[PDB]
Design a binder for these strands. Structure first.
Lengths: 67, 49, 119, 241
RNA sequence: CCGGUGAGGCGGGGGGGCGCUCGCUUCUGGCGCCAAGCGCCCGGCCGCGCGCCGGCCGGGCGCGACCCGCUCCGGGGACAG
């Protein structure tokens, strides 16, 4: 399936594709509020592994924290 | 006269060239400025006090 | 082709519907606890009140603290079948509300006082 | 006469210091809400930044004339929707013992919707044509897929709009669509479509891998640098030549 | 990252012309908005009647008020932080 490919892509963060995507996502998230509701999981495979299921009643939120 | 400030201030009324209204600004009065005097501001404004 | 006349972007006014509940929050409305009998506690029979009734053609009652002068006037009218000119109220230094009920010149305070029983 | 002499003209001089300016169009100077500015600035960044070829590949989308033929073929093999599955089930139930219904008959060919299913039948060399949407919100869903299709020898194409692709199925959106099998009536049309598709994507995949896309400055900066370059050329353009 | 604003005319192009130049304003303690003109249409009434003809009443659109654009304008900047 595609989930194995997605996981293997996400393991290669140092690659140009992943670093470009991460930089764009980080800029977009930094332009938003510290705590807002995200409509869909950014990483469906990771969410499925952690227990998220595409059913009504499942909600995700994106939270920004100071390092 | 502005309290706490030695220099006097001058109230200058303009007209906004977008809406029918009179804008008012509070400039710092220079020497020789008197009431009822036309003061200009812009790139093409002349070199007067 | 709708031009932005002003440089400001304000929130557009969206349609808002009136509440149409499927069920009432409570089964029945609350019965009023300030009926015409609860507002008027008892008439005052003091010597000052007696002189007030005899001379000023008024009546003195002890009223619930939550009652208004309109409520007092309507309660007196419904109870004693009388018409009231004006009502003056005060709060006694004991927690009870005292109201002077001025009677119309057509009726007499002494007669209604005899009818109610105080004298 | 039809003209009343009282009719004057009264022109307006829309200059500086004259009567107030007219209510012109100010769409460029509106303080937009933060989300509009964000969604425009992310497109601006995508234009500015050196997009790697894996993401830049989906910018090359199939043209309109081939896309409409692809949709015409796909409309024939639309999957069964609601109100039709129940009808088929009722037809099979009423014919359980009415006309000797064994129900082995046939499952007609249909499209494939999910990324998982399409990938699974691409790794098995079961698909013949794969259509991939270009505007998936997480691009990570389809990055490997063109490379996998090229490796497995399955022709692939990129179509405008995930909503348009997902309208073939009865849902809001769909990432990809694969033709596992087609009827003998439309086999020639499918062959022509795959011949046209594979001469733009499969055989040129090396160029796509080497084709980075981006590094395009804004019109103001481009115009400024062009003016500077023109002045630099004018320094020695007619003096020598 | 900083400043201004009700984020109101920023960058290119030829339109405009008195002669690069401007959106055309400097003798004075006046006034200046919610369009005039032009052109193309719509509905109702009336007479010619071939009616996108004319008269009355009420409206719509464009020029007037140029076109296209990808960051609101500027100032810093791979550095302040």
């Amino acid at each position: 399936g595609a989930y194995k490919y997605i996981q293997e892509l996400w393991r290669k963060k140092q690659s140009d594709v992943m670093r470009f995507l991460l930089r764009v996502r980080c800029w977009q998230y930094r332009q938003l509020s510290a705590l807002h509701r995200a409509p869909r999981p950014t990483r469906p495979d990771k969410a499925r592994r952690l227990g998220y299921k595409a059913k009504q009643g499942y909600v995700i939120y994106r939270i920004r924290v100071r390092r | 006269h502005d309290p706490g400030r030695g220099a006097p201030l001058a109230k200058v009324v303009f007209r906004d060239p977008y809406r029918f209204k009179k804008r008012t600004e509070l400039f710092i009065a220079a020497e020789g400025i008197h009431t009822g005097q036309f003061v200009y501001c812009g790139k093409k404004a002349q070199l007067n006090i | 082709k709708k031009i932005r006349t002003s440089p400001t972007f304000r929130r557009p006014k969206t349609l808002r519907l009136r509440r149409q509940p499927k069920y009432p929050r409570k089964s029945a409305p609350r019965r009023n606890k300030l009926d015409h009998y609860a507002i008027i506690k008892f008439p005052l029979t003091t010597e000052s009140a007696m002189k007030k009734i005899e001379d000023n053609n008024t009546l003195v009652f002890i009223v619930d603290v939550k009652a208004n002068k309109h409520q007092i006037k309507q309660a007196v009218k419904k109870l004693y079948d009388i018409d009231v000119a004006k009502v003056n109220t005060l709060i006694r230094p004991d927690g009870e509300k005292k109201a002077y009920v001025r009677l119309a010149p057509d009726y007499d305070a002494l007669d209604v006082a005899n009818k109610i029983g105080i004298i | 006469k039809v003209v009343n002499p009282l009719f004057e003209k009264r022109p307006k001089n829309f200059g500086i210091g004259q009567d107030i300016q007219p209510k012109r169009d100010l769409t460029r100077f509106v303080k937009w809400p933060r989300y509009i500015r964000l969604q425009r600035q992310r497109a601006i960044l995508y234009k500015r930044l050196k997009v790697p070829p894996a993401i830049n590949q989906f910018t090359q989308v199939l043209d309109r004339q081939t896309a409409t033929q692809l949709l015409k073929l796909a409309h024939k093999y639309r999957p069964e929707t609601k109100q039709e599955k129940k009808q088929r089930l009722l037809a099979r139930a009423e014919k359980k013992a009415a006309g000797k219904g064994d129900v082995p008959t046939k499952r007609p060919p249909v499209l494939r919707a999910g990324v998982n299913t399409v990938t699974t039948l691409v790794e098995n060399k079961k698909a013949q044509l794969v259509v991939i949407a270009h505007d998936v919100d997480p691009i990570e869903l389809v990055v490997f897929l063109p490379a996998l299709c090229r490796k497995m020898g399955v022709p692939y194409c990129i179509l405008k709009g995930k909503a348009r692709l997902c309208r073939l199925v009865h849902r809001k959106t769909c990432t990809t669509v694969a033709f596992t099998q087609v009827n003998s009536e439309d086999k020639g049309a499918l062959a022509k479509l795959v011949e046209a598709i594979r001469t733009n994507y499969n055989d040129r995949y090396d160029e796509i891998r080497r084709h980075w896309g981006g590094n395009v400055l804004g019109p103001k900066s481009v115009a400024r640098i062009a003016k500077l370059e023109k002045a630099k050329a004018k320094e020695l353009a007619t003096k020598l030549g």
